mmCIF file of C-alpha atoms in Angstrom:
data_model
loop_
_atom_site.group_PDB
_atom_site.id
_atom_site.type_symbol
_atom_site.label_atom_id
_atom_site.label_comp_id
_atom_site.label_asym_id
_atom_site.label_seq_id
_atom_site.Cartn_x
_atom_site.Cartn_y
_atom_site.Cartn_z
ATOM 1 C CA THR A 1 -34.063 7.178 1.084
ATOM 2 C CA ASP A 2 -30.826 7.198 -1.985
ATOM 3 C CA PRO A 3 -27.948 4.102 -1.545
ATOM 4 C CA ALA A 4 -26.219 7.201 -4.024
ATOM 5 C CA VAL A 5 -23.946 8.499 -1.036
ATOM 6 C CA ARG A 6 -23.700 12.071 -3.167
ATOM 7 C CA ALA A 7 -27.522 11.769 -3.909
ATOM 8 C CA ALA A 8 -28.700 10.976 0.076
ATOM 9 C CA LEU A 9 -26.632 13.557 1.442
ATOM 10 C CA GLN A 10 -27.368 16.631 -0.784
ATOM 11 C CA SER A 11 -31.193 16.052 0.488
ATOM 12 C CA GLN A 12 -29.195 17.918 4.172
ATOM 13 C CA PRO A 13 -26.921 20.844 2.942
ATOM 14 C CA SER A 14 -29.366 22.478 0.434
ATOM 15 C CA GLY A 15 -32.624 24.526 0.214
ATOM 16 C CA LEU A 16 -34.719 24.473 -2.509
ATOM 17 C CA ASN A 17 -34.178 26.206 -5.963
ATOM 18 C CA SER A 18 -31.843 28.448 -4.174
ATOM 19 C CA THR A 19 -29.279 29.651 -6.265
ATOM 20 C CA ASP A 20 -27.094 27.179 -5.935
ATOM 21 C CA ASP A 21 -28.522 26.392 -9.237
ATOM 22 C CA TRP A 22 -27.842 29.805 -11.633
ATOM 23 C CA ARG A 23 -29.429 28.702 -14.634
ATOM 24 C CA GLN A 24 -32.800 28.016 -13.546
ATOM 25 C CA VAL A 25 -33.393 31.639 -12.050
ATOM 26 C CA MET A 26 -31.459 33.431 -14.226
ATOM 27 C CA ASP A 27 -34.345 31.231 -16.640
ATOM 28 C CA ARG A 28 -37.115 31.955 -14.170
ATOM 29 C CA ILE A 29 -36.595 35.988 -13.139
ATOM 30 C CA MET A 30 -36.758 36.866 -16.622
ATOM 31 C CA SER A 31 -39.503 35.170 -18.225
ATOM 32 C CA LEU A 32 -37.708 32.423 -20.230
ATOM 33 C CA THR A 33 -39.251 29.512 -18.170
ATOM 34 C CA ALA A 34 -43.068 28.434 -20.262
ATOM 35 C CA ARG A 35 -43.965 26.358 -17.089
ATOM 36 C CA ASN A 36 -45.736 29.810 -15.777
ATOM 37 C CA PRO A 37 -43.789 32.356 -16.711
ATOM 38 C CA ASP A 38 -44.440 36.373 -15.961
ATOM 39 C CA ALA A 39 -44.708 34.375 -11.865
ATOM 40 C CA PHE A 40 -41.213 36.491 -10.543
ATOM 41 C CA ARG A 41 -42.851 39.584 -12.729
ATOM 42 C CA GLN A 42 -46.083 40.149 -10.271
ATOM 43 C CA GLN A 43 -44.156 39.641 -7.237
ATOM 44 C CA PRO A 44 -43.023 42.361 -3.493
ATOM 45 C CA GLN A 45 -40.362 44.511 -4.637
ATOM 46 C CA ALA A 46 -38.109 43.177 -1.922
ATOM 47 C CA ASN A 47 -38.410 40.062 -3.370
ATOM 48 C CA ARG A 48 -38.094 40.803 -7.030
ATOM 49 C CA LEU A 49 -35.166 42.960 -5.509
ATOM 50 C CA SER A 50 -33.422 40.060 -3.850
ATOM 51 C CA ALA A 51 -33.437 37.341 -6.397
ATOM 52 C CA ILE A 52 -31.720 40.502 -8.605
ATOM 53 C CA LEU A 53 -29.670 41.010 -6.782
ATOM 54 C CA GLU A 54 -28.062 37.504 -6.080
ATOM 55 C CA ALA A 55 -27.943 36.871 -9.590
ATOM 56 C CA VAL A 56 -26.011 39.712 -10.821
ATOM 57 C CA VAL A 57 -23.071 39.370 -8.871
ATOM 58 C CA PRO A 58 -23.704 35.380 -7.163
ATOM 59 C CA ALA A 59 -22.776 34.786 -3.116
ATOM 60 C CA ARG A 60 -19.428 32.793 -2.660
ATOM 61 C CA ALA A 61 -20.615 29.643 -0.679
ATOM 62 C CA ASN A 62 -18.601 26.913 1.923
ATOM 63 C CA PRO A 63 -18.616 23.335 0.796
ATOM 64 C CA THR A 64 -16.372 21.539 3.481
ATOM 65 C CA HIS A 65 -19.872 20.323 5.268
ATOM 66 C CA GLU A 66 -21.367 19.117 2.610
ATOM 67 C CA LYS A 67 -17.903 16.867 1.189
ATOM 68 C CA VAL A 68 -17.390 15.923 5.251
ATOM 69 C CA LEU A 69 -21.275 14.413 5.418
ATOM 70 C CA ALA A 70 -21.361 12.776 2.407
ATOM 71 C CA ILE A 71 -18.467 11.091 3.029
ATOM 72 C CA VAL A 72 -19.726 10.353 6.273
ATOM 73 C CA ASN A 73 -22.616 9.064 4.733
ATOM 74 C CA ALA A 74 -21.177 6.678 2.688
ATOM 75 C CA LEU A 75 -19.248 5.298 5.392
ATOM 76 C CA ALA A 76 -22.468 5.218 7.307
ATOM 77 C CA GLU A 77 -24.380 2.953 4.326
ATOM 78 C CA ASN A 78 -21.552 0.864 3.957
ATOM 79 C CA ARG A 79 -21.174 -0.782 7.493
ATOM 80 C CA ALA A 80 -18.433 1.275 8.731
ATOM 81 C CA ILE A 81 -19.001 2.677 12.006
ATOM 82 C CA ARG A 82 -22.987 2.856 13.851
ATOM 83 C CA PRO A 83 -25.121 5.322 13.186
ATOM 84 C CA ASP A 84 -24.349 6.898 16.693
ATOM 85 C CA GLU A 85 -20.729 6.475 15.883
ATOM 86 C CA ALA A 86 -21.352 8.885 12.654
ATOM 87 C CA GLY A 87 -22.632 11.567 13.746
ATOM 88 C CA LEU A 88 -19.717 11.499 16.195
ATOM 89 C CA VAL A 89 -17.276 10.618 13.771
ATOM 90 C CA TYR A 90 -18.992 13.432 11.285
ATOM 91 C CA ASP A 91 -17.474 16.225 13.980
ATOM 92 C CA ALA A 92 -14.185 14.280 14.095
ATOM 93 C CA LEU A 93 -13.295 14.354 10.480
ATOM 94 C CA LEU A 94 -14.893 18.160 10.972
ATOM 95 C CA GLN A 95 -12.219 19.428 12.989
ATOM 96 C CA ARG A 96 -9.357 17.217 11.610
ATOM 97 C CA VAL A 97 -10.013 19.185 8.124
ATOM 98 C CA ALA A 98 -10.341 22.261 9.654
ATOM 99 C CA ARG A 99 -6.947 22.237 12.108
ATOM 100 C CA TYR A 100 -4.797 21.427 8.714
ATOM 101 C CA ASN A 101 -6.783 22.608 5.700
ATOM 102 C CA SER A 102 -5.553 23.661 2.755
ATOM 103 C CA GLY A 103 -6.185 23.588 -1.333
ATOM 104 C CA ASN A 104 -5.214 20.492 -1.551
ATOM 105 C CA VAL A 105 -7.111 18.596 0.954
ATOM 106 C CA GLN A 106 -10.075 19.953 -0.942
ATOM 107 C CA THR A 107 -9.264 18.746 -3.770
ATOM 108 C CA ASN A 108 -7.738 15.096 -2.120
ATOM 109 C CA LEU A 109 -11.704 15.842 -0.597
ATOM 110 C CA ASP A 110 -13.844 15.921 -3.595
ATOM 111 C CA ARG A 111 -11.697 13.070 -4.801
ATOM 112 C CA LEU A 112 -12.308 10.696 -1.841
ATOM 113 C CA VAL A 113 -15.994 11.870 -1.888
ATOM 114 C CA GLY A 114 -15.801 10.545 -5.658
ATOM 115 C CA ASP A 115 -14.237 7.982 -4.236
ATOM 116 C CA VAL A 116 -16.594 7.057 -1.539
ATOM 117 C CA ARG A 117 -19.360 7.219 -4.605
ATOM 118 C CA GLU A 118 -17.883 4.349 -6.404
ATOM 119 C CA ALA A 119 -17.384 1.777 -3.749
ATOM 120 C CA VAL A 120 -21.032 1.999 -2.043
ATOM 121 C CA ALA A 121 -22.245 1.168 -5.281
ATOM 122 C CA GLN A 122 -19.818 -0.830 -5.837
ATOM 123 C CA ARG A 123 -20.204 -2.386 -2.325
ATOM 124 C CA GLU A 124 -24.254 -3.439 -3.737
ATOM 125 C CA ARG A 125 -23.555 -4.516 -6.547
ATOM 126 C CA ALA A 126 -20.850 -7.499 -5.956
ATOM 127 C CA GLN A 127 -23.404 -8.143 -2.277
ATOM 128 C CA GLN A 128 -26.179 -8.631 -5.153
ATOM 129 C CA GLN A 129 -23.975 -10.382 -7.445
ATOM 130 C CA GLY A 130 -22.985 -13.781 -6.156
ATOM 131 C CA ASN A 131 -20.304 -12.774 -2.706
ATOM 132 C CA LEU A 132 -17.270 -14.481 -4.090
ATOM 133 C CA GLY A 133 -15.809 -14.384 -0.645
ATOM 134 C CA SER A 134 -18.067 -17.568 -0.101
ATOM 135 C CA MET A 135 -16.371 -18.975 -4.004
ATOM 136 C CA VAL A 136 -13.332 -18.400 -2.464
ATOM 137 C CA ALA A 137 -14.234 -19.851 1.116
ATOM 138 C CA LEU A 138 -15.596 -23.494 -1.317
ATOM 139 C CA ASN A 139 -12.658 -23.484 -3.897
ATOM 140 C CA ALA A 140 -10.452 -24.099 -0.371
ATOM 141 C CA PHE A 141 -12.695 -26.401 1.105
ATOM 142 C CA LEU A 142 -12.905 -28.014 -2.468
ATOM 143 C CA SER A 143 -8.528 -27.865 -2.569
ATOM 144 C CA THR A 144 -8.746 -29.783 0.699
ATOM 145 C CA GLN A 145 -11.090 -32.402 -0.089
ATOM 146 C CA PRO A 146 -9.417 -35.148 -2.578
ATOM 147 C CA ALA A 147 -10.067 -35.109 -5.855
ATOM 148 C CA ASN A 148 -9.911 -39.052 -6.368
ATOM 149 C CA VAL A 149 -12.871 -41.249 -6.372
ATOM 150 C CA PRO A 150 -11.461 -45.495 -6.791
ATOM 151 C CA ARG A 151 -15.155 -46.159 -7.649
ATOM 152 C CA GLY A 152 -16.770 -43.921 -10.436
ATOM 153 C CA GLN A 153 -15.246 -40.424 -11.532
ATOM 154 C CA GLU A 154 -17.618 -38.599 -13.504
ATOM 155 C CA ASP A 155 -20.178 -38.381 -11.185
ATOM 156 C CA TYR A 156 -18.494 -37.264 -8.394
ATOM 157 C CA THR A 157 -16.622 -34.173 -10.660
ATOM 158 C CA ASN A 158 -20.003 -33.751 -11.858
ATOM 159 C CA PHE A 159 -21.245 -33.527 -8.612
ATOM 160 C CA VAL A 160 -18.192 -30.827 -7.645
ATOM 161 C CA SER A 161 -19.312 -29.096 -11.102
ATOM 162 C CA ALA A 162 -22.472 -28.592 -9.601
ATOM 163 C CA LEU A 163 -22.193 -27.840 -6.252
ATOM 164 C CA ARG A 164 -19.870 -24.755 -7.572
ATOM 165 C CA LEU A 165 -22.699 -23.724 -10.082
ATOM 166 C CA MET A 166 -25.337 -24.209 -7.041
ATOM 167 C CA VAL A 167 -23.235 -21.639 -5.031
ATOM 168 C CA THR A 168 -21.844 -19.629 -7.670
ATOM 169 C CA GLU A 169 -25.882 -18.644 -8.679
ATOM 170 C CA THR A 170 -27.534 -18.296 -6.149
ATOM 171 C CA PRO A 171 -26.905 -15.009 -4.074
ATOM 172 C CA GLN A 172 -27.005 -14.505 -0.235
ATOM 173 C CA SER A 173 -25.835 -18.476 0.070
ATOM 174 C CA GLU A 174 -22.793 -17.979 2.985
ATOM 175 C CA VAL A 175 -20.666 -20.369 2.317
ATOM 176 C CA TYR A 176 -17.275 -20.817 5.068
ATOM 177 C CA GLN A 177 -15.086 -22.461 7.836
ATOM 178 C CA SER A 178 -16.167 -22.650 11.835
ATOM 179 C CA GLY A 179 -14.470 -25.322 12.888
ATOM 180 C CA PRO A 180 -11.954 -27.788 11.868
ATOM 181 C CA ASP A 181 -15.003 -27.876 8.753
ATOM 182 C CA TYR A 182 -17.047 -26.151 5.928
ATOM 183 C CA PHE A 183 -20.408 -25.083 5.704
ATOM 184 C CA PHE A 184 -22.944 -24.178 4.013
ATOM 185 C CA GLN A 185 -26.223 -21.591 5.021
ATOM 186 C CA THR A 186 -28.581 -21.327 1.982
ATOM 187 C CA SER A 187 -29.051 -17.863 3.845
ATOM 188 C CA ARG A 188 -28.147 -15.199 6.757
ATOM 189 C CA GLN A 189 -29.779 -15.227 9.711
ATOM 190 C CA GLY A 190 -31.397 -19.353 7.685
ATOM 191 C CA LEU A 191 -31.741 -22.739 8.615
ATOM 192 C CA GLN A 192 -30.742 -25.460 6.299
ATOM 193 C CA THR A 193 -27.387 -25.634 7.127
ATOM 194 C CA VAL A 194 -25.597 -28.202 6.068
ATOM 195 C CA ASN A 195 -22.253 -29.445 7.907
ATOM 196 C CA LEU A 196 -20.315 -29.889 4.654
ATOM 197 C CA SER A 197 -16.622 -31.604 5.275
ATOM 198 C CA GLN A 198 -19.016 -34.758 6.989
ATOM 199 C CA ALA A 199 -21.499 -34.734 4.036
ATOM 200 C CA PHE A 200 -18.670 -34.998 2.026
ATOM 201 C CA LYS A 201 -16.975 -37.343 3.960
ATOM 202 C CA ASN A 202 -20.522 -39.892 4.016
ATOM 203 C CA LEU A 203 -20.628 -39.731 0.733
ATOM 204 C CA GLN A 204 -16.903 -40.601 -0.546
ATOM 205 C CA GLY A 205 -18.531 -44.348 -0.726
ATOM 206 C CA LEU A 206 -21.311 -44.189 -1.850
ATOM 207 C CA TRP A 207 -19.466 -42.754 -5.789
ATOM 208 C CA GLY A 208 -19.743 -45.627 -8.259
ATOM 209 C CA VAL A 209 -21.048 -48.190 -5.727
ATOM 210 C CA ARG A 210 -24.679 -47.159 -5.468
ATOM 211 C CA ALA A 211 -25.491 -47.424 -9.059
ATOM 212 C CA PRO A 212 -26.533 -51.411 -9.036
ATOM 213 C CA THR A 213 -27.908 -51.651 -4.797
ATOM 214 C CA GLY A 214 -30.587 -49.075 -5.292
ATOM 215 C CA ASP A 215 -33.166 -51.775 -5.905
ATOM 216 C CA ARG A 216 -32.286 -53.094 -2.667
ATOM 217 C CA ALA A 217 -33.284 -50.154 1.026
ATOM 218 C CA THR A 218 -29.983 -52.283 1.838
ATOM 219 C CA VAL A 219 -27.336 -49.912 2.262
ATOM 220 C CA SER A 220 -29.863 -46.628 2.300
ATOM 221 C CA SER A 221 -29.060 -46.410 6.008
ATOM 222 C CA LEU A 222 -25.353 -45.101 5.601
ATOM 223 C CA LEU A 223 -27.005 -42.279 4.197
ATOM 224 C CA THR A 224 -26.646 -39.341 7.152
ATOM 225 C CA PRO A 225 -29.581 -36.783 6.851
ATOM 226 C CA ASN A 226 -26.931 -34.128 6.423
ATOM 227 C CA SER A 227 -25.863 -35.855 3.611
ATOM 228 C CA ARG A 228 -29.954 -35.677 2.031
ATOM 229 C CA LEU A 229 -30.203 -32.279 2.898
ATOM 230 C CA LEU A 230 -26.882 -31.744 1.292
ATOM 231 C CA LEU A 231 -28.869 -33.824 -1.642
ATOM 232 C CA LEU A 232 -32.092 -31.412 -1.517
ATOM 233 C CA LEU A 233 -30.122 -28.019 -1.928
ATOM 234 C CA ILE A 234 -28.958 -29.290 -4.997
ATOM 235 C CA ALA A 235 -31.842 -31.181 -6.870
ATOM 236 C CA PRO A 236 -32.894 -28.478 -9.138
ATOM 237 C CA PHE A 237 -29.609 -28.063 -9.983
ATOM 238 C CA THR A 238 -27.317 -31.447 -11.533
ATOM 239 C CA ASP A 239 -30.606 -31.215 -14.311
ATOM 240 C CA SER A 240 -31.140 -35.103 -15.751
ATOM 241 C CA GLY A 241 -28.350 -36.647 -17.228
ATOM 242 C CA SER A 242 -25.628 -35.524 -15.141
ATOM 243 C CA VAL A 243 -25.816 -38.389 -12.738
ATOM 244 C CA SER A 244 -25.420 -41.520 -13.948
ATOM 245 C CA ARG A 245 -29.408 -42.376 -13.522
ATOM 246 C CA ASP A 246 -30.194 -45.551 -11.656
ATOM 247 C CA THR A 247 -27.732 -45.329 -9.267
ATOM 248 C CA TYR A 248 -29.033 -44.278 -5.408
ATOM 249 C CA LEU A 249 -28.004 -41.068 -4.768
ATOM 250 C CA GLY A 250 -28.792 -40.533 -9.401
ATOM 251 C CA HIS A 251 -32.810 -41.738 -7.934
ATOM 252 C CA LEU A 252 -32.771 -39.779 -4.987
ATOM 253 C CA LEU A 253 -31.690 -36.324 -7.112
ATOM 254 C CA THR A 254 -33.987 -36.866 -10.029
ATOM 255 C CA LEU A 255 -36.375 -37.706 -6.939
ATOM 256 C CA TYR A 256 -35.793 -34.361 -5.402
ATOM 257 C CA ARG A 257 -35.966 -32.854 -8.820
ATOM 258 C CA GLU A 258 -39.278 -33.610 -9.882
ATOM 259 C CA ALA A 259 -40.630 -32.739 -7.165
ATOM 260 C CA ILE A 260 -39.490 -28.734 -6.750
ATOM 261 C CA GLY A 261 -40.405 -29.166 -10.381
ATOM 262 C CA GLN A 262 -44.252 -29.661 -9.973
ATOM 263 C CA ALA A 263 -44.312 -27.769 -7.435
ATOM 264 C CA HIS A 264 -42.533 -23.847 -9.091
ATOM 265 C CA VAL A 265 -44.342 -24.663 -11.973
ATOM 266 C CA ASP A 266 -48.016 -24.595 -10.037
ATOM 267 C CA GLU A 267 -47.521 -21.881 -8.001
ATOM 268 C CA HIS A 268 -45.882 -19.574 -10.564
ATOM 269 C CA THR A 269 -50.228 -20.555 -12.120
ATOM 270 C CA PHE A 270 -51.081 -19.384 -8.888
ATOM 271 C CA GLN A 271 -54.893 -18.751 -8.911
ATOM 272 C CA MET B 1 -42.293 64.625 15.556
ATOM 273 C CA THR B 2 -44.374 66.836 17.762
ATOM 274 C CA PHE B 3 -46.465 64.989 20.740
ATOM 275 C CA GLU B 4 -48.642 67.364 22.365
ATOM 276 C CA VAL B 5 -50.396 66.215 25.838
ATOM 277 C CA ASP B 6 -52.185 67.320 28.969
ATOM 278 C CA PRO B 7 -50.805 68.755 31.806
ATOM 279 C CA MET B 8 -49.346 67.181 34.774
ATOM 280 C CA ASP B 9 -47.371 68.246 37.825
ATOM 281 C CA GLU B 10 -44.959 65.476 37.660
ATOM 282 C CA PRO B 11 -42.515 64.661 35.625
ATOM 283 C CA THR B 12 -43.629 62.365 32.927
ATOM 284 C CA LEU B 13 -41.923 60.327 29.868
ATOM 285 C CA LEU B 14 -43.011 59.771 26.522
ATOM 286 C CA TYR B 15 -42.167 56.382 25.102
ATOM 287 C CA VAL B 16 -41.891 55.964 21.796
ATOM 288 C CA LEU B 17 -41.325 52.593 20.663
ATOM 289 C CA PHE B 18 -40.146 52.871 17.112
ATOM 290 C CA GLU B 19 -41.244 49.785 15.826
ATOM 291 C CA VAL B 20 -38.101 47.636 13.655
ATOM 292 C CA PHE B 21 -36.822 44.743 12.933
ATOM 293 C CA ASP B 22 -34.608 42.692 14.229
ATOM 294 C CA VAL B 23 -33.123 38.845 14.056
ATOM 295 C CA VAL B 24 -30.595 36.526 14.728
ATOM 296 C CA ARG B 25 -28.844 33.536 12.977
ATOM 297 C CA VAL B 26 -27.559 31.284 15.311
ATOM 298 C CA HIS B 27 -24.533 29.613 13.148
ATOM 299 C CA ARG B 28 -23.319 25.999 15.047
ATOM 300 C CA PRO B 29 -20.476 24.949 12.885
ATOM 301 C CA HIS B 30 -18.708 22.563 14.939
ATOM 302 C CA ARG B 31 -19.551 20.518 18.309
ATOM 303 C CA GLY B 32 -19.538 23.684 21.008
ATOM 304 C CA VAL B 33 -19.337 26.504 18.943
ATOM 305 C CA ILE B 34 -21.929 28.649 18.627
ATOM 306 C CA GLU B 35 -22.018 32.384 16.326
ATOM 307 C CA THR B 36 -24.197 34.167 16.072
ATOM 308 C CA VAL B 37 -25.382 36.796 13.407
ATOM 309 C CA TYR B 38 -27.188 40.245 15.252
ATOM 310 C CA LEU B 39 -29.153 42.500 12.172
ATOM 311 C CA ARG B 40 -31.540 45.180 13.906
ATOM 312 C CA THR B 41 -32.380 47.313 10.558
ATOM 313 C CA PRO B 42 -34.357 51.034 11.713
ATOM 314 C CA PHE B 43 -31.081 51.567 14.180
ATOM 315 C CA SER B 44 -28.554 50.189 12.718
ATOM 316 C CA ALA B 45 -26.961 47.236 14.926
ATOM 317 C CA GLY B 46 -24.759 43.697 14.523
ATOM 318 C CA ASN B 47 -22.455 42.042 12.861
ATOM 319 C CA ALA B 48 -23.970 40.899 9.125
ATOM 320 C CA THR B 49 -24.655 44.906 6.856
#
């Protein structure tokens, strides 16, 4: 339903148009509501009296359950526990509060429901913002890699910046380390996993010397297919002129960029 | 009230079943805790008032 744990909670512990919002009831009971006036003037006696009796002297309520359920629901929507664990932990927290209760505890509980509401919102927006963890992993890997290439350097650093931009600009992409290598998955539960360490090791020898040799397919077999996928995934990035043209790497990047381009364009055209 | 009935040769009882309201609200805050709030208005009995 709603992600805001306050909202996704308050649907559970609440009546409908009771005296929790006193102003609306008091407006409707006299005549003040304009949507349908004289509605309350013509109800049975008991009901009328009862509301009125409720209205003049409100009845106090115990909000402990509401706050505890709010924080429990926040934990559930934030993958702190499984839903069955949610049903259990609600009672657990309820007992915990009930055996240590104090005004200070209620104050801290209100503070906590505010904090968890903010936490859920922040987690969602951060998960849709770019997943800083992948950026950290990529920076660690790049620190592992050397920053100096004896044959050509502008293309190398340009490509490195292009990769950085690619991992930053597309959230849901994963960068991590499983074994003694770093990888790059284009999506959770997704295919196209590139062995980043192996790709860089293979590509180290092709940076500044494959420009004159791009015309002859004599060294074309040096490109392992994993690195070919790695280059393919960066076709939309590293636009023309970023990588020096007339280079085997540059030629491949330009071809892939042109191909992907015709495609998306034609596709948004559809019909 | 005043009832008038035909004679019989054996003792009899008259059963008047005053009709009333009788409800129970079940409150179950925690695991394994049951609280009930009884009420029977025209013949008052129970907790709430």
